[PDB]
Paper text:
In the active state of DNA-PK, the kinase core is closed and the ligand M3814 is moved close to the substrate-binding site. Most parts of [name] remain flexible, including the vWA domain, the six-helical bundle (595–706) and the 12 C-terminal residues (721–732). However, in [name], the previously flexible N-terminal region and HhH motif (816–836) are now stabilized between the FAT region and the DNA terminus. In active DNA-PK, the HhH motif is fixed between the DNA end and N terminus. On one side of the HhH motif, there are electrostatic interactions between positively charged residues, including Arg820, Lys824, Lys832 and His833, and the negatively charged DNA phosphate backbone. On the other side of the HhH motif, hydrophobic interactions define the binding with the [name] N-terminal region. Furthermore, in the active form of DNA-PK, a DNA-end-binding helix (2735–2768) from the flexible region of [name] lies near the ABCDE cluster in the middle of the [name] central cavity, restricting inward movement of the DNA. The stabilization of the DNA-end-binding helix is likely to be caused by the fixation of the activation HhH motif together with its flanking peptide string and the DNA end. The peptide string acts as a ‘pull switch’ for activating the kinase, and the inhibitor in the active state is moved more than 10 Å away from its position in the intermediate state.
The DNA-PK of vertebrate cells is central to the DNA damage response and the nonhomologous end-joining (NHEJ) pathway for the repair of DNA double-strand breaks, the most dangerous form of DNA damage, which may lead to genomic instability, carcinogenesis and cell death. Using the latest-generation DNA-PK selective inhibitor M3814 to mimic ATP binding, while at the same time slowing down and inhibiting kinase catalysis, we succeeded in obtaining two different conformations of the DNA-PK–ligand complex from one cryo-EM dataset: the intermediate state, where the inhibitor binds to the ATP pocket before the closure of the kinase domain, and the active state, where the kinase domain is closed up and the ligand is brought next to the substrate-binding site.
Residue numbers in the entry:
A (entry chain A): 2302 to 2437
B (entry chain C): 227 to 555
C (entry chain A): 7 to 496, 517 to 542
D (entry chain B): 31 to 222, 237 to 534
DNA sequence: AATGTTCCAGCGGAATCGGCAGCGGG
DNA sequence: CCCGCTGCCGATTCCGCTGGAACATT
């Protein structure tokens, strides 16, 4: 019931807030490690999957919120994040870049991945918020 | 004076037998029956066009509409009709070679025909695939009516069976060839062969619809089922009466005339007689003509209320179509 | 910054991979425009103005050369948008390039197909025609052929988006407003056009009205009515139809959001009420009701224009009744009843108190026609009421200095009409004028215009009586200087030193002519 | 989604084994793949000319792609089909095209099968459109692109699943190395020959799905169920011509207007009226008046009652039937009433009767909502959906009366021989496949004109009768019919 | 003249998207 | 009075269907 309302995509203060709280909870259960962490991680990945291919914008909003406090969830979804990156414009592309920033370390190549997604041009886009994330 | 207004009975034996279209049934290439197709049930339109006349002089010849094809230059650099060839969208581009080329290489129908393509036994021709704008009826040719008896034999062989005929029909050389069905029929005053068009393969469309039988969100309650049963029974428009043990036809919509041209006639009459008065109202006999008799409505209110109070919330209504005349008064 | 991106924006036009080059071009345009807008230094600012409007590279060249290419539509949009901003940051210092820009707009409108590009072009052309109102350039803007083109657009084109019919109609009106000498021979047709389209959009019994077309047609009619008066004096056919349409557009219909038709209709009213006058006395009850209820609508822009419309309505009806205030005494009685009912009503709406008392003072004129004594009853009722509230009432324990300008205007309006000033309220009137001079800083801006107008109207009022009262001007000015010079100079209020009064006198002794 | 254009990337194998024809002179499989892609372009350029198509070559020598992997050549980034691209692929037909391919990019190399999948993913991910299906057709015959490496195989499987999760479905048609499907590849893991259809199945068709009307079926006072009125069968017709400028082949931007009240001057749509001259006198009224005299009801369906399906006789056809199907999003709970009515009407064999009004200002017209039952099986034969069929009912003058003054029967023995003939010619009508000769010929002529190849094909008219076939399959009984009672008699 | 075809014009579904209001904070 | 988001709702674009008017033929 906790993760369900993250599928109630009509008010940000509902699904986005649920995603924030979910990230906090899941980081907590990871830190104070207990056998509820993988179950919740997979459960949350389930609704994220259900959003990934039908509502990309809400998918990335929720994924950004969760990875604000729980980076390691992004590993399952960085492939989808990269596939979606060329199709976003505005704040959503910034959210995608923050998501990929969360897990920059440990990514095997990340440079073919970025140049392929035309990283140099997106860096010259006129926006102080996104430029900063690109430089990070 | 009730039904005479309600029906076209006031017109009788005034309209002539419309037109015979002469052709020949060809089964294979040897059998041939001289046939006359009479056009039959067919959409009716008014035969007069509203003519654009300029105001304050009411003269048609006083105005001429032009149509120039200029260009997309910085100014509208007009070109002439002699400098124009029709193209066709093909992918992302436009194909020239307008009219004489396609006149040469267009399909040629090889003249009119009513050849038979075979026969279909069962309901492979079901009414939801009729596709025409008209319905023909072919009878016969007179003057040594060997054709008429031959077609009588054909009709009886088709209707004693459930068999139907698939036909390649073409009006003339220029008409696009069509393929259709040929109904047997059951009439005693006469015996025809009724033809309707039939779809090509790029006409019909496959659309996927979620089922309602295997639906859990919309499973109907048996109380709802019997409420709907009561409504249907209370709202029937057919009956068995007059001690004939046969079903009659109440409210025969196939008999009343089109209100469109009737109301147009009355509006034209009123505006001709009274040029200053505004639009008349719709005659009350018109509305009474287009409504079921009172007994079914009176029988129906109660089951209607049962369904209204018994079926789930008919909830969402947030739409409107307000008109300028009523939004500014 | 610029001409680094401008050259790149030029070279993106010839580069392959269009719609991929278009994104880079759009980003170049956005960054370039953002750099240009933010720079405030006339040297760099002029350099940017020259570079943007260059002839080899430059925004207009890009627009004209990227015009047979759909891929750049967004870019074109952006550029036109930016220019509407740049023309606003600038002024007549776009004048050298104006014709250039004008041509560009026209060309875009006739070659681009997206309404999202036609709209910015028409907006820029409207703002050009508005920036260079009276200038040498207007004869160079080929206004006659511009009108010929856009008036052809009304017939020789079928079904435009209506987000561009709005702009086309508004521009056709603005052509009549500015440089009317070249519109002289073709305004009549234009009038018919408006009276045509408006009619449909407001009288169709078959189709939902197009609100944007309504707003545009009303705005264009408003502009056209300047320089091309349609008065009931000589046109009691067209003017009545104009009034009927305005009335329909402002009256309370079914509760409508998207306040754009009432707004334009009653702006037209506020600007040209005098033009259609006889109709204005035939609907005074309903007009007054509608205008009042609009004034309370709480919409920040509808309320303003509604108040202006009410002011013009009251002014016109007062003038009309004053000429013949014998068979219109019913209307005098009605309006006095309404103003008194407002005053007697315990509301916190200072706006309606202000309009009530100001209309009371306005109608004081025609009231003396029927009695010649109620004008003397006024300026005593009014002076006493105004002394009891701005002269002794809670010296600082309230906030009702808001309606002092309206009271003082009312007094000025009243006393212009009475002879034989009661000569014992002269000191109190002087004290009110002195105190409003003293309380000028206490007002917000755009509320300082009204009080300066009130002060100057009072000064004009009692300067037309006789030298005996012209001495009161000397005394009141002397007292105002006494007060403002006697101030210290190095849930909270502020303190004025002397600065806040400067514009005050700068308005009083120099800037009344365009105001009085 | 409605505006979701379909995508398809063609991934063909050029390594070594498709430039030799397995010791045959029939067709090299590379040529077979090029033929297939030509077929798909020419089909979707008139069937689905909004879908995106791409051709990518792997195993080549030189490379081209946004990542610069080796041996991957994207011939065409995915976009709408056109004549230019069909010609660009046509230059690789046959052995002459084979050597042309050899010289422009050159086959033979060590491809990865994990860089190429990545290139396909990038292609899919670099477009700015809503895509309904991402699919990749792999044209290859080899079984083990990993014949000497297992890390390569693991990376390929990884990237295949990595494609699959993003909704990219890889399907493989294998160009039969010996000419017959006995090479059974074990890659059921990677994928989700059936190819003759892909050579030529759909000569011409279209794609869509849309409401065509969103109305309210009102139970005559307040019980309103929202409902869509779909068009199951439509009578498609050839696209309209485009006026094109001779000297440059450009659209010409027509503009029509009316003017010259004997003076010369544009007439606005407000200074004209509409008249009809009857007999001697002329009746005049304005445009909104001539639009409003045809106005009876608001758009929607209103029940007039119920009639059993028996007494509406099924030769009263004048307008192709439509398809009522419940729409809940406008008013909630409509589907429940719709299902109840469907079930009850089916069990009673009674069709509803309504007064139909599709648009705002249009005369009402009587229709019959005939229930139809969804049919389906284990094979999932979804060939009719549940709902209602709007049969349009004629009024009184849409009917026409005929001579009818002819009544002559035939003896009950010609019926037997006609029965012989008809049961001889009895055949199952069809599921499809009577495509319009005029439309198909137009498409073929247009293909020829755009690709200016040789000269236009001749569409084989399925509509024509196989006259000799009937003549031979009847034999000696039609003449027996001709002269049994009625000789010519001269 | 009867009709079928072509052409032009108008309405609506669906997706997109921008800004218009109104609603809290400063 | 400002200032700022943020729902959301209106209009555009793109299709597609229908209707009406014009065409050309025996």
């Amino acid at each position: 019931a906790l993760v369900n309302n993250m599928s109630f995509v009509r008010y940000k203060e509902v699904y986005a807030a649920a995603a924030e709280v979910l990230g906090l909870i899941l980081r907590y259960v990871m830190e104070r490690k207990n056998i509820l962490e993988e179950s919740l991680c997979e459960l949350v990945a389930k609704q994220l999957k259900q959003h990934q291919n039908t509502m990309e914008d809400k998918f990335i909003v929720c994924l950004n919120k969760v990875t604000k406090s729980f980076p390691p969830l992004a590993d399952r979804f960085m492939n989808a994040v990269f596939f979606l990156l060329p199709k976003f414009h505005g704040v959503l592309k910034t959210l995608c870049l923050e998501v990929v920033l969360c897990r920059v370390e440990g990514m095997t190549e990340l440079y073919f991945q970025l140049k392929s997604k035309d990283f140099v041009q997106v860096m010259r886009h006129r926006d102080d918020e996104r430029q900063k994330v690109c430089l990070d | 004076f009730s039904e005479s207004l309600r029906k076209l009975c006031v017109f009788k034996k005034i309209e002539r037998h419309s037109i015979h279209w002469p052709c020949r049934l060809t089964i294979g290439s040897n059998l041939s029956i001289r046939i006359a197709a009479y056009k039959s049930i067919l959409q009716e339109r008014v035969k007069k066009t509203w003519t654009v006349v300029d105001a304050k002089t009411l003269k048609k010849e006083d105005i001429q509409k032009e149509t120039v094809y200029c260009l997309n230059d910085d100014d509208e650099t007009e070109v002439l009709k002699e400098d124009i060839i029709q193209g066709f969208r093909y992918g992302s581009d436009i194909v020239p070679f307008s009219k004489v080329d396609e006149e040469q290489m267009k399909y040629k129908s090889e003249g009119k025909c009513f050849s038979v393509l075979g026969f279909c036994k069962s309901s492979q021709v079901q009414r939801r695939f009729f596709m025409g704008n008209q319905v023909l009826k072919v009878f016969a040719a007179r003057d040594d009516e060997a054709a008429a008896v031959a077609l009588s034999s054909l009709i009886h062989a088709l209707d004693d069976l459930d068999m139907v005929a698939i036909v390649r029909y073409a009006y003339d050389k220029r008409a696009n060839p069509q393929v259709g069905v040929a109904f047997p029929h059951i009439k005693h005053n006469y015996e025809c062969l009724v033809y309707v068009q039939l779809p090509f393969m790029e006409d019909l469309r496959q659309y996927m619809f979620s089922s309602l039988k295997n639906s859990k969100k919309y499973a109907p309650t048996e109380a709802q089922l019997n409420a709907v049963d009561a409504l249907i029974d209370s709202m029937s428009l057919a009956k068995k009466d007059e001690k004939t043990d046969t079903l009659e036809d109440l409210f025969p919509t196939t008999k009343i005339p089109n209100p469109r041209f009737q109301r147009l006639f009355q509006c034209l009459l009123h505006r001709a007689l009274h040029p200053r008065e505004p639009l008349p109202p719709i005659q009350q006999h018109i509305w009474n003509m287009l409504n079921p008799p009172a007994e079914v409505t009176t029988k129906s209110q109660i089951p209607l209320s049962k369904i209204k109070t018994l079926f789930p919330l008919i909830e969402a209504k947030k739409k409107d179509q307000v008109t300028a005349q009523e939004i500014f008064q | 910054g610029v001409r680094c991106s401008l050259l790149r924006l030029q070279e993106t036009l010839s580069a392959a991979d269009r719609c991929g080059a278009a994104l880079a071009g759009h980003q170049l345009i956005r960054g370039l425009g953002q750099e240009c807008v933010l720079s405030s230094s006339p040297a760099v600012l002029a350099l940017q103005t020259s570079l943007v409007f260059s002839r080899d590279f430059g925004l207009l060249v890009f627009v004209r050369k990227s015009l047979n290419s759909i891929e750049f539509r967004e870019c074109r949009e952006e550029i036109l948008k930016f220019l509407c901003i740049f023309l606003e940051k600038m002024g007549q210092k776009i004048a050298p390039y104006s014709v250039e820009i004008k041509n560009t707009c026209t060309s875009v409108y006739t070659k681009d197909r997206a309404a999202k590009c036609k709209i910015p072009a028409l907006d820029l052309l409207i703002k050009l025609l508005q920036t260079f109102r009276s200038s040498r350039l207007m004869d160079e803007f080929k206004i006659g052929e511009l009108f010929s083109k856009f008036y052809g657009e009304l017939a020789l084109k079928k079904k435009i988006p209506d987000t561009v019919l709005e702009k086309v109609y508004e521009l056709l009106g603005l052509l009549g407003e500015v440089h009317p000498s070249e519109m002289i021979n073709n305004a009549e047709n234009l009038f018919r056009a408006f009276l045509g389209e408006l009619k449909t959009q407001m009288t169709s019994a078959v189709r939902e009205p197009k609100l944007p077309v309504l707003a545009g047609c009303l705005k264009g009619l408003s502009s056209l009515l300047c320089n091309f008066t349609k008065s009931m004096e000589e046109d009691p056919q067209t003017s009545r139809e104009i009034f009927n349409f305005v009335l329909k557009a402002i009256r309370p219909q079914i509760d409508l959001k998207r306040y754009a038709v009432p707004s334009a209709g009653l702006r037209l009213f506020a600007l040209h009420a005098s033009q259609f006058s006889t109709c204005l006395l035939d609907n005074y009850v309903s007009l007054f009701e509608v205008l009042l209820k609009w004034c309370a609508h709480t919409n920040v822009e509808l309320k303003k224009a509604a108040l202006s419309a009410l002011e013009s309505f009251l002014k016109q009806v007062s003038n009309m009744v004053a000429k013949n205030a014998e068979m219109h005494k019913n209307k005098l009685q009605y309006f006095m009843e309404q103003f008194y009912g407002i005053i007697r009503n315990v509301d916190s709406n200072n706006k309606e108190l202000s309009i009530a008392i100001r209309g009371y003072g306005l109608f004081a004129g025609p009231c003396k026609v029927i009695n010649a004594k109620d004008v003397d009853f006024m300026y005593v009722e009014l002076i006493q009421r105004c002394k009891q509230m701005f002269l002794t009432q809670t010296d600082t324990g309230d906030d009702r200095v808001y309606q002092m300008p309206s009271f003082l205007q009312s007094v000025a309006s009243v006393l212009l009409y009475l002879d034989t000033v009661p000569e014992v309220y002269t000191p109190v009137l002087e004290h009110l004028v002195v105190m409003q001079i003293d309380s000028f800083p206490q007002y917000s801006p755009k509320m300082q215009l009204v009080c300066c107008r009130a002060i100057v109207k009072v000064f004009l009022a009692l300067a037309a009586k006789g030298p005996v009262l012209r001495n009161c001007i000397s005394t009141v000015v002397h007292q105002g200087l006494i007060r403002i010079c006697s101030k210290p100079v190095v849930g909270k209020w502020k303190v004025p030193t002397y600065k806040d009064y400067v514009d005050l006198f700068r308005h009083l002794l120099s800037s009344d002519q365009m105001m009085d | 989604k409605y505006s979701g254009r379909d995508s398809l990337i063609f991934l063909v194998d050029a390594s070594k084994a498709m430039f030799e024809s397995q010791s045959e002179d029939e067709l090299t499989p590379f040529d077979m793949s090029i033929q297939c892609i030509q077929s798909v372009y020419i089909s979707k350029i008139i069937s689905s000319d909004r879908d995106l198509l791409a051709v990518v070559f792997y195993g080549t020598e030189k490379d081209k792609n946004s990542v610069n992997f080796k041996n991957i050549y994207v011939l065409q980034e995915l976009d709408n089909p056109g004549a230019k691209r069909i010609l660009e692929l046509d230059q690789f037909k046959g052995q002459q095209g084979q050597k042309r391919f050899q010289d422009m990019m050159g086959h033979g190399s060590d491809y990865s099968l994990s860089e190429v999948l990545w290139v396909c993913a990038n292609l899919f991910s670099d477009v700015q459109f809503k895509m309904s299906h991402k699919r990749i057709m792999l044209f290859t015959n080899e079984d083990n692109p990993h014949g000497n490496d297992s890390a390569k195989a693991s990376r390929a499987r990884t990237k295949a699943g990595d494609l699959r999760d993003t909704g990219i479905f890889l399907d493989l048609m294998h160009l039969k190395k010996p000419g017959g499907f006995d090479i059974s590849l074990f890659y059921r893991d990677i994928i989700s020959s059936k190819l003759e259809d892909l050579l030529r199945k759909v000569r011409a068709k279209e794609t869509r799905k849309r409401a065509l009307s969103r109305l309210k079926l009102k139970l005559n006072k307040d019980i309103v169920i929202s409902v869509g009125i779909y068009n199951l069968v439509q009578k498609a017709l050839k696209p309209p011509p485009i006026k094109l400028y001779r000297e440059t082949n450009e659209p010409v931007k027509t503009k029509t207007r009316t003017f010259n009240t004997s003076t010369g001057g544009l007439l606005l749509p407000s200074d004209t009226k509409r008249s009809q001259i009857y007999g001697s006198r002329q009746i005049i009224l304005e445009k909104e008046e001539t639009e409003e005299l045809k106005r009876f009801d608001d758009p929607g369906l209103m029940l007039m009652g119920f009639k059993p399906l028996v007494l509406l006789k099924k030769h009263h056809y004048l307008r192709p039937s439509l398809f009522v199907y419940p729409e809940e999003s406008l008013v909630i709970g409509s589907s429940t009433l719709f299902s109840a009515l469907l079930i009850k009407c089916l069990e009673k064999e009674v069709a509803a009767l309504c007064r139909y009004t599709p648009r705002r200002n249009i005369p009402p017209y009587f229709v019959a909502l005939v229930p139809q039952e969804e049919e389906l099986d284990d094979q999932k034969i979804q060939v009719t959906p549940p709902g209602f069929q709007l049969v349009f009912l004629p009024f009184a003058d849409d009917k026409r009366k005929m001579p009818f003054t002819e009544k002559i029967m035939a003896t009950p023995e010609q019926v037997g021989k006609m029965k012989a003939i008809v049961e001889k010619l009895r055949f199952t009508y069809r599921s499809d496949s009577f495509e319009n000769p005029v439309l198909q010929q137009h498409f073929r002529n247009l293909e020829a004109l755009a690709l200016d190849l040789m000269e236009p094909e001749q569409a084989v008219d399925l509509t024509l009768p196989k006259v000799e076939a009937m003549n031979k399959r009847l034999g000696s009984l039609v003449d027996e019919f001709k002269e049994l009672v009625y000789p010519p008699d001269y």
